[PDB]
Amino acid sequence: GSVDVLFPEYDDPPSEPITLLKRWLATADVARVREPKALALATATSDGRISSRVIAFSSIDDRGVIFCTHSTSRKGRELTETGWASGLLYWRETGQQIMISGQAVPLEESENDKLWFGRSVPMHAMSSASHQSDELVDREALRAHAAELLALGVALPRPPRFVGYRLEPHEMEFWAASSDRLHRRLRYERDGNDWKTTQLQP
Amino acid sequence: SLTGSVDVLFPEYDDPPSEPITLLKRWLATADVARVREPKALALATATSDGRISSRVIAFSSIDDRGVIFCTHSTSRKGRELTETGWASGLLYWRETGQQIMISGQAVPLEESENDKLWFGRSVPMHAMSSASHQSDELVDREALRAHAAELLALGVALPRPPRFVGYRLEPHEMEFWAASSDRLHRRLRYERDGNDWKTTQLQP
Numbered sequence A: 001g002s003v004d005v006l007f008p009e010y011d012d013p014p015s016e017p018i019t020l021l022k023r024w025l026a027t028a029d030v031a032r033v034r035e036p037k038a039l040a041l042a043t044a045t046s047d048g049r050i051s052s053r054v055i056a057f058s059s060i061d062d063r064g065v066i067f068c069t070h071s072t073s074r075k076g077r078e079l080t081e082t083g084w085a086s087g088l089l090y091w092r093e094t095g096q097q098i099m100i101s102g103q104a105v106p107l108e109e110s111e112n113d114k115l116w117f118g119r120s121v122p123m124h125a126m127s128s129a130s131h132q133s134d135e136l137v138d139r140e141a142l143r144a145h146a147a148e149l150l151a152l153g154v155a156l157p158r159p160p161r162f163v164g165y166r167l168e169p170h171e172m173e174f175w176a177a178s179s180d181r182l183h184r185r186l187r188y189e190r191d192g193n194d195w196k197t198t199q200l201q202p
Numbered sequence B: 001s002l003t004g005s006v007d008v009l010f011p012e013y014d015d016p017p018s019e020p021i022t023l024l025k026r027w028l029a030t031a032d033v034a035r036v037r038e039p040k041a042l043a044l045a046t047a048t049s050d051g052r053i054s055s056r057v058i059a060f061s062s063i064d065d066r067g068v069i070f071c072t073h074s075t076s077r078k079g080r081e082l083t084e085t086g087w088a089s090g091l092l093y094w095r096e097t098g099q100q101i102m103i104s105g106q107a108v109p110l111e112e113s114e115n116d117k118l119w120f121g122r123s124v125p126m127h128a129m130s131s132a133s134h135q136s137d138e139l140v141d142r143e144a145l146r147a148h149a150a151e152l153l154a155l156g157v158a159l160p161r162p163p164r165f166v167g168y169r170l171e172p173h174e175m176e177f178w179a180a181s182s183d184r185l186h187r188r189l190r191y192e193r194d195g196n197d198w199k200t201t202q203l204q205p
């Protein structure tokens, strides 16, 4: 079932691409795709070097894709420097890719608090203990610090570096594999105000 | 299933090989033992002149001592971006073992003799569709494209390599190897080019 998945929207696309993104994620859940929200997120520094890492996005709203990270991380510094990001979903089970490219906009502090509060107690402990992407000086010390934080046995406050971003799409591409190699490619791009769609050669 | 997706062994975290490609190859070989599905599916990111980034999956052909070899159309979006700005980053992620590998570098075009060999190693149906398609250009008539690919296959003549079909080597200046840990202190090993040598660092998760 990794080829020729149903894609009626290829010929009749929704006005907004986030609508199709949500529909695809729902079908992925029905197909029991493993970790469908694991997004390969690329960012860049100003000189143009690009970096990448997996991010499991938190949610989707009508304006974009929400994720959280440490602002002092490597991706954090790059998001602050240039703003540009490109996230890629790829589901091996269904032969589908979704590319979401645009600007990552920092969320408000109330939104950051909500993102932190939503997570588990063990997550809070290591995320409070670790300064993501800084050099690790002493593995044993960092483990012990996370364990001491966990043992406080109460809800830990949000570290100031723990922040959310909304990836606001400027362009999105949907790709669905075809057994005859003529893959279905649907591209959305911002043309002044609104969305222009096109089908692409494979 | 032959592994959990946490706590895979990673002895190189505390004693890294001098060259990161050596570790990349070891990881890919272990990924095959672990029966990882499509381990070579690389999320390849490129950028245009103004810094806008785009990404897509590429399945790389091979790995030599200098980098990761892949093929694509030079006139595709990625091909134009590589020509414009050079920098690229590729990400591998294996759900079955909890591992990711980040390869950041420049894509160096291969020689024409290498491109010819790569085209020869492909099937005639691949030749026909690759010849009939201008990757990433607007598709105006789908049935026409399908029909032209079928015509090329039916001729039974050797199909020439279109000049747009080319290979690149992604040559790293930076790599990171990441392996999940159940206690959340994930193993993170960064390689950065340092002249003719490499420098390594362990990172906080």
Ligand SMILES: Cc1cc2nc3c(=O)[nH]c(=O)nc-3n(C[C@H](O)[C@H](O)[C@H](O)COP(=O)(O)O)c2cc1C
Pocket (backbone or CB within 6 Å): A038, A051, A052, A053, A054, A055, A056, A057, A067, A068, A069, A070, A073, A074, A075, A076, A132, A133, B100, B178, B205
């Ligand atoms: C499945 C998966 C999900 C992840 N989700 C996040 C996440 O939501 N936020 C985050 O900061 N890192 C997440 N990570 C860790 C990142 O891949 C990366 O290691 C970390 O964010 C540091 O990246 P950087 O050094 O490029 O800034 C996740 C990793 C995996 C494998």
Ligand SMILES: Cc1cc2nc3c(=O)[nH]c(=O)nc-3n(C[C@H](O)[C@H](O)[C@H](O)COP(=O)(O)O)c2cc1C
Pocket (backbone or CB within 6 Å): A097, A175, A202, B041, B054, B055, B056, B057, B058, B059, B060, B070, B071, B072, B073, B076, B077, B078, B079, B135, B136
């Ligand atoms: C599993 C997988 C492997 C792929 N391998 C390649 C490849 O080796 N070369 C290629 O040009 N496109 C490959 N593609 C298609 C790309 O994802 C993408 O559609 C394409 O190359 C056009 O990208 P662009 O418009 O960003 O240039 C692959 C897609 C998938 C899902």
